Design a protein around this ligand. Structure first.
Ligand SMILES: [Ca+2]
Ligand SMILES: [Cl-]
Length: 258
């Protein structure tokens, strides 16, 4: 597998705050067409080859600051990470899905050459918090060629996602009162096809804002999910299959094995 990057993982390496790659950033102006700009995090070393990318959307009334900590933590594992702002803070999930796609198109078509020369434009993923998690879902129905989708405590009025054909990893917060897992996260998960590579992880005790705070349980499995499906890196299957059972996890569902 020529998409493999970094040394073989271990239980400890997927929990590391700082991965094997050193990280740099490129700021993207608010004036970009199709989304509210953002920050591109990328691996600095080029000697292992190019990397896939993930665009990351904030939630309703939130800004890219709520999603900042994913930038270095994930990019240092060998990914290009793009934490974006939305056109307005009040944009709905659908718009966020569109804007996630414009952010990835920007990476591919117009980003600085330091980014573009490190990029594999065919290996792309979406991730989002809350309404941005809804956006992550929306994005995959808009662009089925995406490699992965990670909706974080997602929020969406549309509860059926039977048409999704992108490997989807949904993360819920047990006590989430803004996007209750019973009417968002779990209906979304159980609606994805049983034949789709997919997963639900519910964080014990967590509230809606758990994804905005550095969380080793979130990070380790977000990284595994992106490695396994953006890189097709089966070295990371061990952490995804069978169901992880960390003390921090209230519940986990999956269609293992992939
Ligand atoms: Ca704009
Ligand atoms: Cl909450």
């Amino acid at each position: 597998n020529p998409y493999e990057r970094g040394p073989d993982p271990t239980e400890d390496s997927i929990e590391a705050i700082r991965g094997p790659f050193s990280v740099a950033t490129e700021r993207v102006s608010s004036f970009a067409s199709g989304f509210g700009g953002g920050t591109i995090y990328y691996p600095r070393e080029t000697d292992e080859g190019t990397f896939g990318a993930v665009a990351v959307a904030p939630g309703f009334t939130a800004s890219q600051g709520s999603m900042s900590w994913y930038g270095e933590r994930v990019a240092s594992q060998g990914f290009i990470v793009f934490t974006i702002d939305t056109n307005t803070r009040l944009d709905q999930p659908g718009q966020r899905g569109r804007q996630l796609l414009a952010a990835l198109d920007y990476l591919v078509e117009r980003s600085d050459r330091k980014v573009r020369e490190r990029l594999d434009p065919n290996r792309l993923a979406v991730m989002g918090h809350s309404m941005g998690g809804g956006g992550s879902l929306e994005a995959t129905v808009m662009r089925p060629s995406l490699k992965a989708s990670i909706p974080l405590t997602p929020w969406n009025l549309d509860k059926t996602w039977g048409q999704v054909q992108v490997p989807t990893f949904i993360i819920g917060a047990e006590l989430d009162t803004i996007a209750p897992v019973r009417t968002h996260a779990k209906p979304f998960y159980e609606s994805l096809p049983s034949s789709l590579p997919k997963a639900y992880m519910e964080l014990d005790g967590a509230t809606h804002f758990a994804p905005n705070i550095p969380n080793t349980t979130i990070a380790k499995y977000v990284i595994s999910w992106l490695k396994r499906f953006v890189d097709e890196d089966t070295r990371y299957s061990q952490f995804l299959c069978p169901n992880p059972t960390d003390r921090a996890i209230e519940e986990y569902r999956s269609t293992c094995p992939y």
